[model samples]
Target: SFSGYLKLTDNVYIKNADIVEEAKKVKPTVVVNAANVYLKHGGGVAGALNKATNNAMQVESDDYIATNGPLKVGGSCVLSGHNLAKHCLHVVGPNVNKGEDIQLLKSAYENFNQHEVLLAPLLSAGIFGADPIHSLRVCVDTVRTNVYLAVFDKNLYDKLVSSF
Candidate 1:
């Protein structure tokens, strides 16, 4: 019943579980959602979180980024006015169809500002088409906080477990 933990630092770690379930386990102070250039919380992890918090996530993201226009890859914004969690970090990650940019992915992790327990999805690994394992590796290497790589895709979870 153990989800494997690959510890990278005293605080940083790589882990896999249902995204929502893992978030609860970590009780993160910050939740990072892999987002599009546009801060529209309509699909993928954004959509899930929006549903979880009754659209509060979207409303807050919209307010924070407010017509700053679509964020470029590697750009991020933090939202604080929500009950979903203490803080939310929305990062514009790579869209594989647009080409995989490893630096962009790493920069997203680097953008995190605090040493809080953070929960994040495999950034850009889904509809964006980045490799899950590679994205996970980057996250583990880049984050300064205790971060969990919450995995919601069943097949990807099995793959991640097997890779270890």
Candidate 2:
């Protein structure tokens, strides 16, 4: 069974918890959402948070940029208009990219490294289909603040524990 926080560093943490609940308490300086380059809140963390913040994410997404193809594998954008945090950092993950996935993940994390408190998911790992352990490791290595990563499943949590 999974329980408690897995500390990767004094600044980064991993835990199996509801993303919304974590958001309520963490009140992070920025919340990273795995997004599409087209700026649509179609699925994954983008969908959930779009709903949570009353479509504010999509509104901001629309104002930010427009594109048919996805953002370059490592592309990122910081969006305003959400009460969930000061801003939402949108990072296009690997599923749609035709190139190196790990570097894409690293770039996503780095995009918001300036924040002191951050909340992020395992980039490219869920519906995007990348390895959870590897994504988690990348997040641990890339983020430089008090960031909490939400682990959505037991096996991923187990793998994180074993990795530590």
Candidate 3:
């Protein structure tokens, strides 16, 4: 219910909403899965997404890892949506900001630049360890069309809205 945003292109903007539930109905919208390098759909954002899709995503993700290998930090791959969304964009946000950390996170957010109507989580800010403000900044920095970020915490939500 806390809807606030910064507009980018004609209809392009970065806004906030639930990535999982909201994604189920949005048209042509893709969800950016905050994933681990191993592409494991076992926990966190990945786990929720897996459950929503009835573990079908987990099977494909595992097979994807088997065929290609662990997704390199800052890398991405697309997996089927199976009715939850138009599709899923899996990007790995590094566990921490090190040598390539910032760039990795930047590129992962930049991954949203690849498609339309991307509903994403605040990648790398939790479980992986990254500055909340900075990670939010990166997510916002990468301009894209209808990129709806899912932020449930009201204080943090207001922080971005209030950047004051």
Candidate 4:
């Protein structure tokens, strides 16, 4: 079952379980107590919902987003919220028609640079909101961003904060 990849080209990326933690850190700003909220574009409520479920575990948005709750991405549902599930947070994007994948990526990047942690989460949430297989294509479009940030230009760290 351990197959597939996280593609990233010049200004985008595909995050799976392994790299998600690292990706989260790079985002800079972050919100921890978000509940079952729908985003127009993202993986789920915390990007943790898509994590592979181990068993009949309980999870919640508050728990994964923050360390104060009593649930986890790979656990069981212990609370209640819109689309709340076990071991995952339910993040949804604006259900308004549809949006451009690249636009969503740009928004996520903008929010991250602006320290808009709450808005940052919208990226993955929007991707999920696509509600279609083409969503994966969205991820593929900008996977290169990760590479540029990681190897091509670490010096960008300064500009991202200052210009942003």
Candidate 5:
């Protein structure tokens, strides 16, 4: 059985200011928001089970970047998209070349979606560490451009796949 990530921070939803306000109701130290998209079927069973153990768990983007410093996706690429409190994705794109930014972002997103559970403001695989940027670039270069990311908890993933 895979262990789950227990977010110890003040988790909050930063997908938007409304989520920010919503998080304040609980006084969360961090906020994360989800990007509503259709995730491929069969991808979140383990994540859902882990979430039951903690209510603070949430899927968010901008919020994570704000609270958890910059998120590095593709190689040598840095993503600081909005008026976020922290820097968004900061990766050294492969070879420090252009277009690698989008490439890394794509790979990072795919890796993130594969996870069973994702906490808001996570400095995780899709967002951190060495070649942090290079690994991302390779992934980004391989993903379908027309696809959008849909965040899901284990429960949600199970529900969707079970019906098929």
Candidate 6:
């Protein structure tokens, strides 16, 4: 009931659907997890993924943080995907209210551009307090790779029909 798409180019697009569900079924080499600095993946997109993987997501993320450290805003951490993809990229987005939201959100998205095939999650839009469409504009603009942005937010999808 919630699937929509806006084409940007032959290779780039934005779609609205169950991101976690679609992500699990995707062939993208990497799926972006809009994670917290601690990589707990506690709520929203990250939470759904962590639960979908039966805690494998959290355990793996914890192991990484234990060895490395909390992911810096705009910085990313990579972990083996628990069948979601071959690998997952966990990137921290700036708290929209904390400081420079656009700069950091754009940075996070640019980092996602590293891979040619990627599934992008809506970044920092809810608990992170980012303006959904605004954040998406930044994400959309940053696409360089063959990226498919999966947004579960229907409002974003509806508005996106004409905005992009």
- Which predicted model would earn the best TM-score? 6
For model 4 the TM-score comes to 0.27
Off by over 4 Å in 5: 1-17, 25-72, 75-100, 114-164
lDDT per model vs. reference: 0.72, 0.73, 0.73, 0.29, 0.28, 0.78
lDDT of 2: 0.73
> What is the alpha-carbon lDDT for the whole of candidate 6?
0.78
Give lDDT tens digits, candidate 3, residues 14-110. 4555566656656345778888878888877888888988999989898999999888888889988766776889988877844446667887887
Question: What is the per-residue lDDT of model 5 for residues 1-164, given as tens digits with 9 covering 90 to 100?
Answer: 11222211232111211222222333322222322111111113213311332322233323444566443433222222222212222222222232233334444444333322222321122222223323323333443322121223344333323432
**Distance from true location, Cα of 17 in model 4, Å:** 1.5
Off by over 4 Å in 2: 1-4, 66-70, 96-100
How does model 3 score by TM-score?
0.83
Instruction: Please provide, for model 6 over 1-164, each residue's C-alpha lDDT reduced to its tens digit, 9 standing for 90 to 100.
Output: 22345676766677877767876666457878888889988888899878878999999988888999898898898887787777888888887766645578888888877787777776778778887777767876776777777878788677865676
Better of 3 and 4 by lDDT: 3
Task: Give the poorly placed runs of model 3, Cα more than 4 Å off.
Answer: 1-16, 97-100
Scored against the true structure, residue 1 in model 4 reaches a CA lDDT of 14
Question: Could you say which candidate leads in lDDT?
Answer: 6
User: Model 1, which residues run further than 4 Å from truth?
Assistant: 1-10, 24-27
List candidate 6 stretches off by more than 4 Å.
Answer: 1-5, 97-101
Provide the TM-score for each candidate, comma-separated: 0.81, 0.83, 0.83, 0.27, 0.21, 0.89
lDDT of 4 at 156: 31
By summed lDDT, the worst window of 10 consecutive residues in model 5 runs over 34-43
TM-score-superior candidate, 5 or 6: 6
Give the Å shift of residue 40 in candidate 6: 0.9
Model 6, residue 22: displacement in angstroms?
0.4
Residue lDDT tens for model 2, 56-90: 77876776665334466667777762777777777
lDDT sort, best first: 6, 2, 3, 1, 4, 5
Question: Which ranges in model 4 have alpha carbons more than 4 Å from their true place?
Answer: 1-5, 18-92, 96-129, 139-164
